[PDB]
Symmetry: none
Subunit: 78 residues, 10 copies
């Protein structure tokens, strides 16, 4: 179930994005509703450090690929 | 007193902005000194998460309304 | 001749905004109700001053200015705007829309005198869209 | 006539990407191999759908779009693009490059019919550059030292890899590689490079000199 | 018309270079095999980019440039080079040999269009000699 | 008319070099101060004789000769040198630059008579560059990190100093300084530079941005 | 004829900047003192090179360029600039302001020859404003 | 006396070079005979470790400054 | 036999060069193969101090006389 | 007509070099004695082959070549060399100095035929200077 996917405290972001995109594209949603759902799940899941990282984006991110690129650039190396 | 207003740890930002604008406009300042004071109080009060959110603004915010809009857009949903 | 809105209706609308919030469908319906007749910039400005708090009022002033600027861009993109005229001497400046033009600053009677009905309806629609934006933004 | 790529080659390439990763030189060589003939947007799109995971695939779609947009800007900046024509009626829109134009959506045969060879090679080069970007993004030069027991060719390989796969401009890589050869590369090789009767002005020349005069041990 | 080399053959050759090394007679035989048809500068450049590591690739670029310069000196020493022509307008510059000339940078199709067969065989022999030098130098 | 430098200023500068060393920024600032007006070869030679010890003075004579030779090569490469003239009879020989020409050996008055202002400024710049070389030689950029307690302007000063006073080409200093700002400068400032809505393409712009948005503490 | 500033005054000013900082009113007064006579681009450039550290010097170069660009915009907005002339042949380019024009690069004598007094005072005021900006920014 | 100057067993090389250049330039030699004497004194004095370091110089050193630079580069840190 | 000639631990270099050139020129090699053999025997014989001295030659030595001159210049006086 | 040097004098000089060494003043005097008449390249070459060992002979060949090259540079710097002529057809190449030119290789008679007396004295002085260099270098 896509709506139950959370980014674990120790999980990296690319694994979380892979799992989420897999569960959203392999589901019962229409094809035209996958990108907005993936974006809004990146924003509300993806534990509050990345949540604030996406929130304070000086540019407007309108695609899952752009969000992934931005987060991978500005992520907290740890 | 406007210079004693802090954003509480649990208080939202719109309540803090309302309280601050109320106390600044209902005070003894000249009319031409309210906007700069409100801006500089948004920047130095408004606990360090929002302080850093305003500091790292790719655009220059030159009005309390613009600062409020920016912070409401990029705020950490919690 | 300018007639002010009832302070009783304004008080009821302010309490509605206070209890239900800015985004409830009942609040938007009430605003649409009090936004029925074309209002002068003075009326809408005082209405938003009374019903909205300080910070939402600042946000609303910003949004109203932006929407009025979009309207004026569309107006310079089409000389057949119901606010415009046929000649260049009737072109509508933002000072005339925001009520800042000559003979209008602080005077609602003169405002109602010089303003066009198309000007009034454009100002009103702009204010409604700005209210919607601020309501969607505040919460 | 459109001929699909072998699913056997695609399966082998997918397992290569799965074990070696996106950035290994063997993986890039394999991608260059399967990127030999000019592919139609359908082919490259399905290839990246199969070999890449979901998140790298999203990143790659983004990067491919950006590179194709740069290509279309260069195309409107020069009417002599091998994808363009002489008249204005042959100007190539991004719907035709991404395979979204009329008569192409979902149909590889019609795609192969209407597309130009210049269009195909431009799409292919764009996709290769996008793959390189995403590979560099999915997974520090100034922290690289030559270990006490490490040979010099391994150190040079590691350093050139980290310098070329970094955020430096292209015109700043050679001087940085040289000055890192001189200051890293433990003091025996440091003195070997310092006492060079000739002036070495290229990483290849420094590597050749050091390999010639190195202390066999 | 330009046809690329098979990535399967290139992968097999890369693994051969990886296990046997650069100097084994089997590796040189395999390189001679994949060096049979006259290759365009694009082909040889990408081939050496894939089969060789970074440092051997730098060494090979150096050696290839030196050998091509010797070829161009012999070409200016004899106007009957299979890469040259009879008039002075067909003299071959190093930008045309390394693929850096106009209409060739990054485009293998245009490369194959403007290049001569003598140019191709000279480039190929130069690249083979450079590979031999680098292989003798690396180990 | 030639006027000598004050022995009081020279004594103060000599004691500065004696206590602070050759490489301190205060010492280089003092040298730039006493290198303000264009000096005659006699002045610079005696100045370096007094402020520098014997071995640094030998090194400085060597470096000054090399830099003057580079200047004379550039002068024979361009007949429009402010030291040269239009005809061939005004070409400037190294005997005239080092003060060894006829009518100049040991005589500062005649020196000041025959020398050109362009000659003087070229000699002065050459001597300054030679002093910088010898100071860097008498007593590594890729090892510079911003300390946990160090401010950012101190780190930037140290890094720019070590990068500009090194063996890199002049055209490779700005990219290296930028990429060292990005990878050094402990992860708070690293993330501050990473999340820059604008693209920063100059060390000054990066410094300004970081100074604006830095965490006051 | 160009006369350099005393290295004694420059050393004293550098030590003042070193002990008091960039923003103290005594430091700004000292800078105003050494900014009394109109300086040539060479003078101000070397002065800021000596008194400022590397990073403040980079910031100051940036700010000086921006202020000079504002000056040149005002100059193209008014043909009566004391740096400009009446005809179009006296229009002042940024290469002439920053000392980069022909006959000026590295030569202070030629600089003093070709520059106008209005040019000098504009450059000086621009440099002073840039110093103020950088001082307000550094601390 | 310049011809009696030796580099002590514990003395550094820059001190020895300073002392030697001082004694050679402040002596009765002609000006055109100081550099060759300084070089040949660097080569024969300057205890046998530095003697062998100068002897095995792949380049030809023809100036006291160049010899000093070379020795300072390749000296045995101790 | 030329291929059995080694520079002894205590032997000087000119004696070794004399012995090697004697044995190479008084042998069964063609005249056009003596110089390369003498060079490659200087490089592989001539105990590792001189081997490294010849290896780290900033110039390319392409003649036995040039190698002998270089080694005699930069040899470790002992 | 070419006359060879006496093998008795050459044997005595070889034994002198063997007992006294290369650098003794008596040895240099003896060499100056046997270097009195201008010798052909054949004579000096065989003389140095006999009196010098293998390694000093290699060194001497090197030094002789270098000195002859300096002589040829001075010759191209002055068309009035006693080895040169007035026209360009008498310019002396190093093949003619080292005895490598056409009609001279291995034949001393033809050598003596085509060579100039200025050529002979220049070759002789060059060989003497080269001998001095090698003698100073060997010990």
């Amino acid at each position: 179930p896509w709506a139950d996917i959370m980014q674990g405290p120790s999980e990296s972001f690319v694994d979380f994005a892979n799992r989420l995109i897999k569960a959203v594209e392999g589901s019962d949603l229409p094809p035209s509703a996958r990108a907005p759902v993936i974006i809004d799940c990146f924003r509300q899941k993806s534990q509050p450090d990345i949540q604030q990282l996406i929130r304070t984006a000086p540019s407007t991110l309108t695609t899952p690929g752009e969000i992934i690129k931005y987060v991978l650039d500005r992520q907290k190396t740890a």
